[PDB]
Amino acid sequence: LHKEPATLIKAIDGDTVKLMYKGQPMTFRLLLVDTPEFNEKYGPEASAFTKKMVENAKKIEAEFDKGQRTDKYGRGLAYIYADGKMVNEALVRQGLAKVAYVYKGNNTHEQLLRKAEAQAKKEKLNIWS
Ligand SMILES: Cc1cn([C@H]2C[C@H](OP(=O)(O)O)[C@@H](COP(=O)(O)O)O2)c(=O)[nH]c1=O
Ligand SMILES: [Ca+2]
């Protein structure tokens, strides 16, 4: 997989963010995770965590997997990095997202993220509390 440039347009919630990618505004949905909706428990904390991560970053990159790059809503499907740290993995490691939506052929970082979930769960963090 390859990291590609993007710039932040706007934080949305725990697992979607609006980025400019190849010069075009797009909403990205983070691969392999599910944060609570803003209206749900930990939803505001997830939104806050992603917002802080992407807004503080000097460099945002989007990494597509091997499969579908857009979902049925037209959202980009990618792993998003902030100054080299994967947002997807960070949310899971903090107990603010569950590993989820693991579809065949867009699942390169599956085992990485499950390892993070196990550790958040061992720690009883947030969702696992
Ligand atoms: C993460 C992801 C979501 N989706 C679709 C599945 C779900 O369809 P449904 O809308 O029919 O439930 C939806 C969940 O995204 P959200 O968690 O943002 O609501 O997005 C994909 O198709 N591929 C993906 O990789
Ligand atoms: Ca969600």
Side-chain angles (χ1 to χ4, degrees), residues 13-16 29 33-38 40 75 101:
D13 77 346
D15 58 24
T16 58
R29 174 64 167 77
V33 304
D34 193 30
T35 49
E37 298 300 321
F38 182 76
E40 286 156 6
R75 302 184 298 182
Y101 296 106

PDB file of all heavy atoms in Angstrom, residues 13-16 29 33-38 40 75 101, ligand 2:
ATOM      1  N   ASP A  13     -16.789  13.515  12.186  1.00  0.00           N
ATOM      2  CA  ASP A  13     -17.031  12.754  13.416  1.00  0.00           C
ATOM      3  C   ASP A  13     -15.920  11.695  13.646  1.00  0.00           C
ATOM      4  O   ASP A  13     -14.827  11.815  13.092  1.00  0.00           O
ATOM      5  CB  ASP A  13     -18.426  12.157  13.440  1.00  0.00           C
ATOM      6  CG  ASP A  13     -18.548  10.932  12.583  1.00  0.00           C
ATOM      7  OD1 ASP A  13     -17.636  10.662  11.750  1.00  0.00           O
ATOM      8  OD2 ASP A  13     -19.596  10.243  12.760  1.00  0.00           O
ATOM      9  N   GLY A  14     -16.173  10.696  14.485  1.00  0.00           N
ATOM     10  CA  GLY A  14     -15.064   9.844  14.922  1.00  0.00           C
ATOM     11  C   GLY A  14     -14.425   9.085  13.756  1.00  0.00           C
ATOM     12  O   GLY A  14     -13.211   8.864  13.754  1.00  0.00           O
ATOM     13  N   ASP A  15     -15.237   8.726  12.779  1.00  0.00           N
ATOM     14  CA  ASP A  15     -14.712   7.889  11.683  1.00  0.00           C
ATOM     15  C   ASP A  15     -14.938   8.445  10.278  1.00  0.00           C
ATOM     16  O   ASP A  15     -14.749   7.699   9.292  1.00  0.00           O
ATOM     17  CB  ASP A  15     -15.187   6.417  11.781  1.00  0.00           C
ATOM     18  CG  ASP A  15     -16.697   6.300  11.785  1.00  0.00           C
ATOM     19  OD1 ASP A  15     -17.359   7.242  11.254  1.00  0.00           O
ATOM     20  OD2 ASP A  15     -17.199   5.218  12.206  1.00  0.00           O
ATOM     21  N   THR A  16     -15.313   9.701  10.158  1.00  0.00           N
ATOM     22  CA  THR A  16     -15.327  10.331   8.819  1.00  0.00           C
ATOM     23  C   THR A  16     -14.683  11.707   8.938  1.00  0.00           C
ATOM     24  O   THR A  16     -14.804  12.370   9.948  1.00  0.00           O
ATOM     25  CB  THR A  16     -16.771  10.544   8.258  1.00  0.00           C
ATOM     26  OG1 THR A  16     -17.526  11.351   9.142  1.00  0.00           O
ATOM     27  CG2 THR A  16     -17.503   9.246   8.165  1.00  0.00           C
ATOM     28  N   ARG A  29     -14.282   7.792   4.812  1.00  0.00           N
ATOM     29  CA  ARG A  29     -14.710   6.933   5.881  1.00  0.00           C
ATOM     30  C   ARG A  29     -13.564   5.985   6.195  1.00  0.00           C
ATOM     31  O   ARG A  29     -12.931   5.414   5.306  1.00  0.00           O
ATOM     32  CB  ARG A  29     -15.931   6.122   5.389  1.00  0.00           C
ATOM     33  CG  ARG A  29     -16.414   5.076   6.351  1.00  0.00           C
ATOM     34  CD  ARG A  29     -16.950   5.639   7.709  1.00  0.00           C
ATOM     35  NE  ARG A  29     -17.694   4.666   8.548  1.00  0.00           N
ATOM     36  CZ  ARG A  29     -17.118   3.720   9.266  1.00  0.00           C
ATOM     37  NH1 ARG A  29     -15.782   3.622   9.362  1.00  0.00           N
ATOM     38  NH2 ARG A  29     -17.882   2.925  10.011  1.00  0.00           N
ATOM     39  N   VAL A  33     -13.020   0.303  10.952  1.00  0.00           N
ATOM     40  CA  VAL A  33     -13.413   0.753  12.315  1.00  0.00           C
ATOM     41  C   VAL A  33     -14.867   1.199  12.364  1.00  0.00           C
ATOM     42  O   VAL A  33     -15.438   1.532  11.302  1.00  0.00           O
ATOM     43  CB  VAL A  33     -12.505   1.877  12.805  1.00  0.00           C
ATOM     44  CG1 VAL A  33     -11.020   1.406  12.755  1.00  0.00           C
ATOM     45  CG2 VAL A  33     -12.684   3.155  12.019  1.00  0.00           C
ATOM     46  N   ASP A  34     -15.401   1.325  13.586  1.00  0.00           N
ATOM     47  CA  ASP A  34     -16.711   1.923  13.795  1.00  0.00           C
ATOM     48  C   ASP A  34     -16.618   2.711  15.081  1.00  0.00           C
ATOM     49  O   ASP A  34     -16.476   2.134  16.162  1.00  0.00           O
ATOM     50  CB  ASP A  34     -17.775   0.838  13.871  1.00  0.00           C
ATOM     51  CG  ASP A  34     -19.195   1.395  13.782  1.00  0.00           C
ATOM     52  OD1 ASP A  34     -19.366   2.434  13.132  1.00  0.00           O
ATOM     53  OD2 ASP A  34     -20.118   0.729  14.299  1.00  0.00           O
ATOM     54  N   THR A  35     -16.754   4.019  14.959  1.00  0.00           N
ATOM     55  CA  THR A  35     -16.937   4.836  16.148  1.00  0.00           C
ATOM     56  C   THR A  35     -18.440   4.975  16.436  1.00  0.00           C
ATOM     57  O   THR A  35     -19.261   4.885  15.524  1.00  0.00           O
ATOM     58  CB  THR A  35     -16.335   6.261  15.932  1.00  0.00           C
ATOM     59  OG1 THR A  35     -16.786   6.825  14.690  1.00  0.00           O
ATOM     60  CG2 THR A  35     -14.799   6.203  15.870  1.00  0.00           C
ATOM     61  N   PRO A  36     -18.799   5.267  17.695  1.00  0.00           N
ATOM     62  CA  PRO A  36     -20.182   5.568  18.069  1.00  0.00           C
ATOM     63  C   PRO A  36     -20.618   6.828  17.318  1.00  0.00           C
ATOM     64  O   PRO A  36     -19.763   7.642  16.982  1.00  0.00           O
ATOM     65  CB  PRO A  36     -20.087   5.866  19.557  1.00  0.00           C
ATOM     66  CG  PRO A  36     -18.838   5.170  20.024  1.00  0.00           C
ATOM     67  CD  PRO A  36     -17.894   5.265  18.853  1.00  0.00           C
ATOM     68  N   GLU A  37     -21.907   6.944  16.986  1.00  0.00           N
ATOM     69  CA  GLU A  37     -22.418   8.168  16.351  1.00  0.00           C
ATOM     70  C   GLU A  37     -22.312   9.255  17.410  1.00  0.00           C
ATOM     71  O   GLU A  37     -22.247   8.962  18.619  1.00  0.00           O
ATOM     72  CB  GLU A  37     -23.872   8.004  15.853  1.00  0.00           C
ATOM     73  CG  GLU A  37     -24.117   6.935  14.777  1.00  0.00           C
ATOM     74  CD  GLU A  37     -23.333   7.159  13.486  1.00  0.00           C
ATOM     75  OE1 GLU A  37     -23.205   8.332  13.066  1.00  0.00           O
ATOM     76  OE2 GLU A  37     -22.831   6.165  12.889  1.00  0.00           O
ATOM     77  N   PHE A  38     -22.264  10.514  16.975  1.00  0.00           N
ATOM     78  CA  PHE A  38     -22.139  11.613  17.902  1.00  0.00           C
ATOM     79  C   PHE A  38     -23.205  11.537  19.002  1.00  0.00           C
ATOM     80  O   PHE A  38     -22.936  11.873  20.180  1.00  0.00           O
ATOM     81  CB  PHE A  38     -22.210  12.966  17.175  1.00  0.00           C
ATOM     82  CG  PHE A  38     -22.042  14.138  18.096  1.00  0.00           C
ATOM     83  CD1 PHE A  38     -20.781  14.457  18.581  1.00  0.00           C
ATOM     84  CD2 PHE A  38     -23.139  14.884  18.524  1.00  0.00           C
ATOM     85  CE1 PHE A  38     -20.604  15.518  19.506  1.00  0.00           C
ATOM     86  CE2 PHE A  38     -22.976  15.957  19.427  1.00  0.00           C
ATOM     87  CZ  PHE A  38     -21.702  16.265  19.930  1.00  0.00           C
ATOM     88  N   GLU A  40     -24.448   8.986  20.425  1.00  0.00           N
ATOM     89  CA  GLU A  40     -24.286   7.797  21.292  1.00  0.00           C
ATOM     90  C   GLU A  40     -23.173   7.945  22.329  1.00  0.00           C
ATOM     91  O   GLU A  40     -22.362   8.864  22.250  1.00  0.00           O
ATOM     92  CB  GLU A  40     -23.988   6.565  20.420  1.00  0.00           C
ATOM     93  CG  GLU A  40     -25.215   6.059  19.680  1.00  0.00           C
ATOM     94  CD  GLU A  40     -24.877   5.276  18.454  1.00  0.00           C
ATOM     95  OE1 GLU A  40     -23.675   5.031  18.226  1.00  0.00           O
ATOM     96  OE2 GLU A  40     -25.809   4.950  17.680  1.00  0.00           O
ATOM     97  N   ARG A  75     -18.155   7.953  -0.346  1.00  0.00           N
ATOM     98  CA  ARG A  75     -17.083   8.251   0.636  1.00  0.00           C
ATOM     99  C   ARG A  75     -15.808   7.511   0.240  1.00  0.00           C
ATOM    100  O   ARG A  75     -15.870   6.329  -0.094  1.00  0.00           O
ATOM    101  CB  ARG A  75     -17.512   7.856   2.082  1.00  0.00           C
ATOM    102  CG  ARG A  75     -18.785   8.574   2.517  1.00  0.00           C
ATOM    103  CD  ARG A  75     -19.170   8.275   3.938  1.00  0.00           C
ATOM    104  NE  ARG A  75     -19.450   6.843   4.085  1.00  0.00           N
ATOM    105  CZ  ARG A  75     -19.858   6.255   5.202  1.00  0.00           C
ATOM    106  NH1 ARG A  75     -20.054   6.964   6.302  1.00  0.00           N
ATOM    107  NH2 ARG A  75     -19.974   4.937   5.267  1.00  0.00           N
ATOM    108  N   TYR A 101     -16.645  -3.822   9.955  1.00  0.00           N
ATOM    109  CA  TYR A 101     -16.723  -3.605   8.524  1.00  0.00           C
ATOM    110  C   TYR A 101     -15.499  -4.163   7.789  1.00  0.00           C
ATOM    111  O   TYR A 101     -14.950  -3.535   6.855  1.00  0.00           O
ATOM    112  CB  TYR A 101     -16.982  -2.165   8.133  1.00  0.00           C
ATOM    113  CG  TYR A 101     -18.346  -1.694   8.624  1.00  0.00           C
ATOM    114  CD1 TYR A 101     -18.447  -0.829   9.708  1.00  0.00           C
ATOM    115  CD2 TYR A 101     -19.542  -2.148   8.020  1.00  0.00           C
ATOM    116  CE1 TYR A 101     -19.689  -0.439  10.218  1.00  0.00           C
ATOM    117  CE2 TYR A 101     -20.772  -1.720   8.476  1.00  0.00           C
ATOM    118  CZ  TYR A 101     -20.840  -0.882   9.591  1.00  0.00           C
ATOM    119  OH  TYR A 101     -22.067  -0.475  10.098  1.00  0.00           O
TER     120      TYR A 101
HETATM  121 CA    CA B   2     -19.982   5.093  12.777  1.00  0.00          CA
END
